[PDB]
Design a binder for this molecule. Sequence first.
Ligand SMILES: *[B]([O])([O])C1=[C]C2=C([C]=[C][C]=[C]2)S1
Ligand SMILES: *[B]([O])([O])C1=[C]C2=C([C]=[C][C]=[C]2)S1
Lengths: 358, 358
Amino acid sequence: APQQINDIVHRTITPLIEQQKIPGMAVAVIYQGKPYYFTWGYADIAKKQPVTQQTLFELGSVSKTFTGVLGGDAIARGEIKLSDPTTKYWPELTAKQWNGITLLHLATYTAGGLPLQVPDEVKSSSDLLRFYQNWQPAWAPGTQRLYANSSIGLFGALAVKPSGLSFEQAMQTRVFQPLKLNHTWINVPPAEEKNYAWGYREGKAVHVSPGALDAEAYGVKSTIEDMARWVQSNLKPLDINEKTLQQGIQLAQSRYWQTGDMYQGLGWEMLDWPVNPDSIINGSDNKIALAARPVKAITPPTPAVRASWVHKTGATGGFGSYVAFIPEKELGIVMLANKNYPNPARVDAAWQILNALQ
Amino acid sequence: APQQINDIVHRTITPLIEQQKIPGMAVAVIYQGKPYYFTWGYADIAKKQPVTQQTLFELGSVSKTFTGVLGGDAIARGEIKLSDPTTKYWPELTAKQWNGITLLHLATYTAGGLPLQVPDEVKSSSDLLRFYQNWQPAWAPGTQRLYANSSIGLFGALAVKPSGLSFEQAMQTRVFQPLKLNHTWINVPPAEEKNYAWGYREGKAVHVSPGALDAEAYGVKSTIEDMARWVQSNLKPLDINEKTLQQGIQLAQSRYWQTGDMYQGLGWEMLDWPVNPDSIINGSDNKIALAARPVKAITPPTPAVRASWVHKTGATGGFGSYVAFIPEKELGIVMLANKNYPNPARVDAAWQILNALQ
Ligand SMILES: *[B]([O])([O])C1=[C]C2=C([C]=[C][C]=[C]2)S1
Ligand SMILES: *[B]([O])([O])C1=[C]C2=C([C]=[C][C]=[C]2)S1
């Protein structure tokens, strides 16, 4: 790749891998619409297996971007409406507090305080219904944003209801295949187990644990090659053949709510570019990222803005991921590590690199 | 054209012209994407000039659809947001009532009672400011719909402001040229006057008179061939090369408000397909079409629904037009006459014709 790209990346990431003590890392820089890959360390320290272009990484919450786009596609297909009441897709969700909660609230974390996590005890479908039936809101819908798996996860599950397909099958056929993401999985199959990296937390090797709505909120595993494609597709959706997916990617980057200098899309979060580095860096700290924040409705939603810094952090017990891109500059980056390290460290590194290239 | 199309068309239009005493008429049916033309009578009864595929007709309010799409292209360009307050584009608009009135309210007739017509006495730019400064809302914005030229017209004037172009130039440059609408004009040039049909009001030959915001609200003149191209462009916008125009068209067919079983877009009006003929035919009568009706906001707006009956009526002193199409079926029709006759009569004819073709 151009000396330029090589230079910043080495100077930025290599030291970061050292300071954070990251076992393995794959980085893809999309420059002028083209990807360049960088690789470091092991995918498995025990077997001294290295990180390659085919190593599978748990994306954590970056999965939410897939869920948001699957949702956008279902809307363009005419199968769902964001203005539709929740109970319209789950008739048993009868409790009165669910009355004015629509799919939009579920998708953007503005339903009124649904919890970040679905309790570990909730397992059966029964457990899930009872949990939602008993939930008491902390705020009226549409007033506060509270980042949560239990909100977007339910959105994913109801969004695929009309299609009659399971969440995984709707995702593979409607999103993975058309984009040719031939190595992205919710449930990695036998054949891919050997490329599936171990996550590392406290020197021990881990893989994400099953849980309710895990697939809908954080269950995707992928490679830097597919992820790079994922970023190219999101950078230039008009280049996408399938009509509903092209429109879905756009709906996913529309601005529905604003809080501070951030805008909430479906899965994706956006900021006007140029961006204030302190802002995105500090804002990514979990003290802030996980707190409730009042939101201002954007009426009507602003369609996908080219001059945006679009991004999403993800993490699981032993994995730390990050994606960011600026459509207007055909610039984007993907960072996958088999170690969960500080969000501010990822965002800073990404900002150094991208700011350097335009 | 196929005898099927030819037969339905003549069976339906012939008695209509007879019944209504329409001097001349042009009709185009878009079947499976291809257009088919039909013409009858005179463009100029005095000089016995026949109506042809080159005859120019005044579109009347059908012009609001062009204005809506021009607005949408400007949103797609990032030059304006429908969520912005009117005063962000007209600072001199100091009156307090203008506080929470957005571009969306203006584009959809929900500002709070803006009048149907701008008074004839309003001629100067200053005259327009005064008129708007002294206007007193009847209702809160976003609560009632009142069809108005003073509302959508102001929207068109403000939407082109950032661009630095005049309304006619932005329209030619951003909508007409790209779609190859080469015989569509706001001001018909001397070279084209010979094709400009006369309108007929109680036996007298008339052309539309100038008025404040006429260009923006009812100023376009076109031919049956360009209108067919206009219909095809709106039926399949994803076939448009221009990125922002293709987006603009989709934004104009999105659903922002609902009233009865009608949905309001930017210029365009829609109903779910299949549709009750009487649901349209009746709702069309100028008495029912311009009255005060409360609206329900669609939050967030539903993207262009393929299964809809999309249409718009238009009339000037001597002209009556109608446009209707069903994307899902790639079917549409355009009817241009140099006589302003009953709206229900147009809708009835259009329905007979399209219903007969699937
Ligand atoms: B994402 O990586 O921000 C996630 C946050 C949590 C997940 C699962 C369980 C609890 C928090 S995925
Ligand atoms: B459209 O054809 O419905 C129109 C309605 C009016 C126009 C001009 C002046 C007053 C009403 S165009």
